[PDB]
Amino acid sequence: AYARTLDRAVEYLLSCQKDEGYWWGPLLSNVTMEAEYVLLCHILDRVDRDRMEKIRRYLLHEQREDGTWALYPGGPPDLDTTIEAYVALKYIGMSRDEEPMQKALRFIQSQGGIESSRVFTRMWLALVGEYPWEKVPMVPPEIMFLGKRMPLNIYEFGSWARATVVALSIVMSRQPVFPLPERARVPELYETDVPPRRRGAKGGGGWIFDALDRALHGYQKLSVHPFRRAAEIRALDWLLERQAGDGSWGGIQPPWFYALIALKILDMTQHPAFIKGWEGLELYGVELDYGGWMFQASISPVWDTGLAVLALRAAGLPADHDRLVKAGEWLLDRQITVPGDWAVKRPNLKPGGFAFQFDNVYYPDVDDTAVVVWALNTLRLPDERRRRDAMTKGFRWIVGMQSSNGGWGAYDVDNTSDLPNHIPFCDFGEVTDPPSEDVTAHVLECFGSFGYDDAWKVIRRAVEYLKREQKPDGSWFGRWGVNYLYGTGAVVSALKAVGIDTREPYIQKALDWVEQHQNPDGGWGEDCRSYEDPAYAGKGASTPSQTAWALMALIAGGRAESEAARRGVQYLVETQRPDGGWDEPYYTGTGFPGDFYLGYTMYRHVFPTLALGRYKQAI
Amino acid sequence: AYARTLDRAVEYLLSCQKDEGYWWGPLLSNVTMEAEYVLLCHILDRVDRDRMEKIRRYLLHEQREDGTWALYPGGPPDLDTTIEAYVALKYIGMSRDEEPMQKALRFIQSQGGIESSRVFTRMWLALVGEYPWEKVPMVPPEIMFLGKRMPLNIYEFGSWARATVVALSIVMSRQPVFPLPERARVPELYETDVPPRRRGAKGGGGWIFDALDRALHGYQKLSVHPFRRAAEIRALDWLLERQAGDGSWGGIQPPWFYALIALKILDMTQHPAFIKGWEGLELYGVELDYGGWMFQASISPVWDTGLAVLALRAAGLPADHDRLVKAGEWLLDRQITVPGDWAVKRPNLKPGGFAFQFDNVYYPDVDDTAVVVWALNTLRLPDERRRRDAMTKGFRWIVGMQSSNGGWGAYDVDNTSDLPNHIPFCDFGEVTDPPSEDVTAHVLECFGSFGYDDAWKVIRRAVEYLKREQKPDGSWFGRWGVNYLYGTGAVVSALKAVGIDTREPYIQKALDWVEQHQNPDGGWGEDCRSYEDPAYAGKGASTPSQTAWALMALIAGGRAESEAARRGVQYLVETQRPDGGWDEPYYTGTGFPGDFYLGYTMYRHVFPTLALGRYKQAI
Ligand SMILES: C=CCN(C)CCCCCCOc1ccc(-c2nsc3cc(Br)ccc23)cc1
Ligand SMILES: C=CCN(C)CCCCCCOc1ccc(-c2nsc3cc(Br)ccc23)cc1
Ligand SMILES: CCCCCCCCOCCOCCOCCOCCO
Ligand SMILES: CCCCCCCCOCCOCCOCCOCCO
């Protein structure tokens, strides 16, 4: 039955593979990337009229009937996203009258306008002079003086926020303004009666930071700030030391863009770092068929390659299939052998992890490292001592990265501080990188492949962690993927691999929860709204990936031969396209719960393949 | 008569011009560049068999009958240069038996072998493990802590030594060893009876530094050096901040090579600065027609372009000659607008100088700046406000750069400390950058073109400087060009331009000195030996450039219609080639008096043209 569905899915993956041997699907997010890119170009005085065009097309193409833009497809109109898109389009050259602008503008106003937007949106507008710099939370370069062990030192922030903070402190120190030509100034963002419904800091704001901010805005007013040049230079140097190979910073949009502006501020456009940083941008860009251009929030070659391999293997292809071997070889050249920012908490730990992007040595993450190492462990490569060696370094690093509670974060160890989550500036997404169920799960299944089990103390501490984190209804939160189906799917698949007994209560209680949210059409789905409203947990239009996930949990928990299980497999078999792939107009990936979602282009092909390979395995 | 000679020279220069509008002749030095490059490649594990070949041919081609290598052509065998060339060749794959090796080896031994070589030579050999690291003068990264105003702080060293010192402190801090394969180890450099005739520090070594060094080598022995990681990172950061546009450091061979090794030491080969640093090298390389490859100690596009323009103008071509305008345009895009290391002594001075290389913004030099600004002053470009403006910035910068004694240095102000010239490490060439007669002269003639004169206090302070620096026999030392003919030529040409009266005593006393050293064949010449033995002052085989220089002094001093003058003009008219150029198998450029000489490939064509244009001018 499904066999053909599977052989067709395989043939498709293999065709999607690149020459070098890796897989790489585009990462989808929202228009703030392109919108900011446009403003970035304006700031750097590097506007390509041709690019603007492809961008206007993209922006419009993404706008909805109501004239708004959301974070995920089929999501509520988002104010911030729409404001930035609005400003972007007006700059590119669109009359504030035209249908699109008008509809959007009304929505912006019906919300309290500019004043109801996140800090970043006001800060970007601040940069082009459409908003007072003094109404923007302040982050001083002096932050660079806080030692390793001090509240709010840059190492208490998550890897992603850290770099952004540093780059920003330089910018907010100079508070520069790059005026927009008159034709694009957007005062009409203030023209509203609705009261500003301002979003506060993540975990609530102590009157302390509130005061401290005001203090900092005052200190900014002075005519002489002692030791500030030093603080700046200490930040510029922090930046220069970490610039990634592709010229980015952390391989993510934010710090990259800010670091570039910061360098512009410091009159270093003639410097290598800037040139390389500016040039690197193109690699993240994407030409869309309908004539548009989009910029990726980040790139996922390694991650894609890793999963693709695991999929194709669990699906059939021999451990030495020349096509997989090509990938295995590629993955080895990716391993990172130098110290990163994690070393600040594990100085005696030898490097051996992998990153998400192509070249980003200072930020390997536990999630990738585990998937890659695990993937390798399922291949038969020529240089068997290199494969055997890589795995060990990777394995040991993961082990050494395990946090206190027994789980694993993504980039750092015990990056569980809470202080940063309260400062004014941080009102968007996560700011710290504490252990998560999904990452911890992947780590467990990775070890599991090697044979390790519940006897080893490391695994136990982890399992205890997952047990304590389980949700009342037996589900598990999905930190880096939408959502409860993603996490529950991971956890169960893992626990089954580390020896745990699937017949246990909590395991069963989870399995049940899965069967219970099966959509009528056979498959499962879970809308991104499940991060905001608990009523959506498990609910949503069925998607190939989310179906595959719930399907893995069922297969892992022994319920392979089940109604729900048979039903799910059917769904994937029917919904499959003639070429072998699958479609998925929804996002199933999570950047920050409730604030930023991603669309992993390969998920729709890889996971269904992996799940089918596991079904065919359980028979 | 000479007219055709001149018209021919013009046609030639115009043909040598590049499309972009600039002139750029290769800079010649000695084989330590290529020899070190080979060792550098070995260290970085990046050996291109094909390149090694082109280098072996080059090394061998440059070797002389006696089997040695000198600093300048027709110069005394140099021990250091030969040792390094010897080690280079043996590495590339040459038997220690072969004719060239044997002859060279014997010379090496008849000198006391390895032990009689400059610090660098022993340090390079130290790097590949053919010499104890503890016998090499030490330079600690801690040197990075000395504040702006403290004996031996990195800003008391000349721009060229500064960068080298910083890069090195990282290297000498780790004292790494990159073993040579056995087939190339060179113990035979010790096999000698002759006593080691060691060269001491430039200005003599106080027993203090001698002890201090011993101290440092001891402190090196310890198991814990507090604040050393910080010292290194302060050095590493200093380098990252200053890397040049082309990927070099200072646009000179030394710091560039060491900075690269330093980065490799810190495991930063995956970093942008390294990559760009490594790739940049090719631009300095040169394919030789006989199948060899040489590496330029530095590049001189700006310098060449500037003089070429001044030559072609003083020779005839209209100020708006489309071909010159192309150059003028190019020269404007070269002006540097950011702060460099000079700003540490002139923080309130606005940037507006030019560099020697293509892209090297942190190190504009006074010499180039003056020639360029002046060259521009003689042109009629389309954007007349840009030209008018640039000159202004440049003019002002030069002025603001003038040192205490009234003269100008090359890169810094009052970089006249003496302490650095005594430490053990510095036993090769200049270590500081004090004012010089030649630079000061060029500056004067620069202003002169603008109409300024002896009335303005600036000019006076300078002239007084020159007056006090004049030599007993009425000659002026040549700091950046071989030698007394170069300086005297500059000085007089200048003084004549700033209004001074040529009929004065010291002026005449100089002019005479010129006529008195005119070789029988009609032209003038001055061997590089004139830096070592005062007997050679003004003496040496006649060259087109050196003739043009003495010829300029004479034309400036009113002695245009003179026997010596007529005679000289004749020489240039005869020695001229059919194509229009001139040959010059000798070096007429100075890197460091007595230690490093350069061959400015364009001098032979440009100066003769300039001198002839000035003769035809005085009639
Ligand atoms: C399935 C999980 C596998 N892991 C291994 C993925 C690694 C992390 C996510 C990949 C990179 O994506 C990001 C893009 C942007 C950000 C960001 N930082 S700060 C920030 C601010 C705003 Br506003 C919007 C976005 C960001 C973070 C991750
Ligand atoms: C004609 C004068 C115009 N001026 C405007 C020229 C600017 C100075 C010379 C151009 C660059 O040439 C150099 C090459 C190498 C060095 C060097 N530094 S440290 C060093 C050590 C050793 Br050993 C050998 C060479 C060096 C310096 C200058
Ligand atoms: C200059 C010191 C070299 C020794 C490096 C060990 C330092 C321990 O790493 C601490 C973690 O900080 C992150 C570093 O990686 C970023 C680039 O810094 C490069 C030079 O060390
Ligand atoms: C980050 C401080 C920016 C203010 C610059 C003025 C500093 C004075 O210059 C001192 C001279 O040091 C050389 C600097 O130029 C090299 C690169 O540093 C870049 C950012 O300043």
Q: Verify that B98 and B42 share a domain, yes or no.
A: yes
* Residue whose C-alpha is closest to residue A499's, from A464, A461, A449, A548: A449
- Cβ neighbours around B592 below 10 Å, total: 18
- Cβ neighbours around B502 below 10 Å, total: 15
Q: Write the CB contacts of B440 (distance below 8 Å, at least 6 apart in sequence).
A: B406, B407, B408, B462, B465, B466, B494
Q: Are B363 and B409 in contact (CB under 8 A)?
A: no
- Ligand 2 mean position, distance from CA A236 (Å): 30
Q: Write the CB contacts of B204 (distance below 8 Å, at least 6 apart in sequence).
A: B422
Q: Which amino acids bring their CB within 6 angstroms of ligand 4? A: A 229, 232-233, 236, 266, 268; B 241-242, 339, 341, 343-344, 362
- What residues of chain B have any CB closer than 8 angstroms to a CB in chain A? 236-237, 240-241, 243-245, 247, 267-268, 270-273, 275-276, 337-339, 359, 361
Q: Tell me whether strands B293-295 and A589-592 are parallel, antiparallel or unpaired.
A: unpaired
Q: Residue B123 has which token pair? A: 């340090």
- What residues of chain A have any CB closer than 8 angstroms to a CB in chain B? 236-237, 240-241, 243-245, 247, 267-268, 270-273, 275-276, 337-339, 359, 361
Using alpha carbons, list the distances in angstroms from residue B589 to B27, B48, B283: 9, 32, 22
Q: Verify that B453 and B598 share a domain, yes or no.
A: yes
> By CB neighbour count within 10 A (0-12 exposed, 13-18 middle, 19+ buried), where does A316 fall?
middle
Task: Report the residue of chain A nearest B337, measured CA to CA.
Answer: A267
In A275-372, which ranges are E strands? 285-287, 293-295
Among left, alpha and beta (phi > 0; psi -120 to 50; other), residue B316 is left
Among left, alpha and beta (phi > 0; psi -120 to 50; other), residue B129 is left
Distance CA A106, CA B215 (A): 76
Q: Map tokens 């922006």 to a residue.
A: A59
In chain B, residues with a C-beta closer than 8 Å to the C-beta of A260 are none
- The resolution in angstroms reads 2.8
* Sign of CA pseudo-dihedral B339, B340, B346, B350: negative
Q: Verify that B138 and B86 share a domain, yes or no.
A: yes
- Ligand 2 mean position, distance from CA B252 (Å): 7
Distance CA A490, CA A374 (A): 14
* Residue whose C-alpha is closest to residue B526's, from B613, B606, B593, B469: B593
Q: Are A581 and A12 in contact (CB under 8 A)?
A: yes
Q: Are B268 and B35 in contact (CB under 8 A)?
A: no
Q: Are A74 and A64 in contact (CB under 8 A)?
A: no
* Residue whose C-alpha is closest to residue B284's, from B363, B365, B359: B359
Helix (H) or strand (E) holding A16: helix A2-16
Q: Verify that B395 and B247 share a domain, yes or no.
A: no
Q: Are B309 and B14 in contact (CB under 8 A)?
A: no
Q: Are B385 and B392 in contact (CB under 8 A)?
A: no
Using alpha carbons, list the distances in angstroms from residue A313 to A100, A122, A307, A331, A380: 48, 48, 10, 15, 11
Q: Verify that A341 and A438 share a domain, yes or no.
A: yes
Q: Write the residue with the smallest CA distance to atom 15 of ligand 4.
A: B340
Final residue belonging to a domain, choices A298, A317, A346 = A298
Using alpha carbons, list the distances in angstroms from residue A517 to A317, A493, A568: 33, 18, 12
In chain A, residues with a C-beta closer than 8 Å to the C-beta of B361 are 270
Dihedral angle, C-alpha A257, A262, A266, A268, nearest 10 °: -20
How was this structure determined? It was done by X-ray
The residues pairing with B590 across neighbouring beta strands, listed in sequence order, are B597
Question: Which structural domain, as residue segments, surrounds residue B72?
Answer: 27-298
Q: What is the DSSP string of B479-545?
A: SSSS-HHHHHHHHHHHHHHTT--TTSHHHHHHHHHHHHT--TTSS----GGGGT-GGGTT-S---HH
Q: What is the DSSP string of B13-77?
A: HHHH--TTS-----EE--THHHHHHHHHHHHTT---HHHHHHHHHHHHHH--TTS---SSTT-PP
- Cβ neighbours around B520 below 10 Å, total: 7
Using alpha carbons, list the distances in angstroms from residue A4 to A135, A279, A573: 61, 45, 9
- Cβ neighbours around A401 below 10 Å, total: 25
Cβ of B481 below 6 Å from ligand 2: yes
Q: Write the CB contacts of A438 (distance below 8 Å, at least 6 apart in sequence).
A: A367, A476, A477, A478, A479, A480, A481, A486, A487, A490, A491
Helix (H, G, I), strand (E, B) or coil at A408: strand
Distance CA A252, CA A261 (A): 15
Distance CA B108, CA B81 (A): 10
Q: Write the CB contacts of B82 (distance below 8 Å, at least 6 apart in sequence).
A: B68, B69, B104, B107, B108
* Residue of B268, B271, B361 with shortest CB distance to A270: B361
Final residue belonging to a domain, choices B282, B298, B314 = B298
* Cβ contact A276–B271 (<8 Å): no
* Residue of A267, A276, A338 with shortest CB distance to B272: A276
Q: Verify that B21 and B50 share a domain, yes or no.
A: no
Distance CA A44, CA A259 (A): 12
Q: Verify that B193 and B329 share a domain, yes or no.
A: no
Distance CA A575, CA A411 (A): 36
Q: Write the CB contacts of A475 (distance below 8 Å, at least 6 apart in sequence).
A: A484, A487, A488, A510, A513, A537, A538
Q: Verify that A258 and A371 share a domain, yes or no.
A: no
Q: Map tokens 């923007």 to a residue.
A: A136
* Cβ contact B243–A272 (<8 Å): yes
CATH of residue A220's domain is 1.50.10.20
Distance CA A562, CA A560 (A): 6
* Cβ contact B271–A245 (<8 Å): yes
Q: Tell me whether strands A293-295 and A27-28 are parallel, antiparallel or unpaired.
A: unpaired
- Ligand 1 mean position, distance from CA A431 (Å): 11
* Residue whose C-alpha is closest to residue B93's, from B57, B61, B45: B57
Helix (H, G, I), strand (E, B) or coil at A144: helix
Contacts of B456-462 spanning 24+ positions with Cβ under 8 A: B458/B399, B458/B402, B459/B498, B460/B406, B461/B402, B461/B405, B461/B406, B462/B402, B462/B406, B462/B407, B462/B408
> By CB neighbour count within 10 A (0-12 exposed, 13-18 middle, 19+ buried), where does A111 fall?
buried
- Give residue A243's identity as a one-letter amino acid code: Q
Q: Verify that B166 and B145 share a domain, yes or no.
A: yes
Q: Verify that A307 and A294 share a domain, yes or no.
A: no
Q: Write the residue with the smallest CA distance to atom 13 of ligand 4.
A: B341
Q: Residue B219 has which token pair? A: 């402190």
* Residue whose C-alpha is closest to residue A119's, from A200, A234, A46: A200
Q: Are B610 and B599 in contact (CB under 8 A)?
A: no
Distance CA A266, CA A260 (A): 10
- Ligand 3 mean position, distance from CA A262 (Å): 22
Q: Are A604 and A28 in contact (CB under 8 A)?
A: no
- Cβ neighbours around B147 below 10 Å, total: 7
Final residue belonging to a domain, choices B278, B298, B318 = B298
Q: Tell me whether strands B589-592 and B596-600 are parallel, antiparallel or unpaired.
A: antiparallel
* Total domains, chain A: 2
Using alpha carbons, list the distances in angstroms from residue B76 to B114, B529, B597: 18, 9, 13
Q: B215-251 burial, b if ≥16 CB within 10 A, otherwise e?
A: ebeeeeeeeebeeeeebbbbbbbbbbebbbbbbbbbb
Q: Verify that A48 and A61 share a domain, yes or no.
A: yes
- Cβ neighbours around A592 below 10 Å, total: 18
In chain B, residues with a C-beta closer than 8 Å to the C-beta of A337 are 267
Distance CA B609, CA B308 (A): 9
- Cis peptide leading into residue B415 (ω within 30°): no
Q: Are B306 and B394 in contact (CB under 8 A)?
A: no
Q: Are B363 and B302 in contact (CB under 8 A)?
A: no
Q: Verify that B21 and B56 share a domain, yes or no.
A: no
Using alpha carbons, list the distances in angstroms from residue B342 to A465, B246, B247: 59, 20, 21
Q: Write the CB contacts of B613 (distance below 8 Å, at least 6 apart in sequence).
A: B6, B311, B313, B314, B315, B316
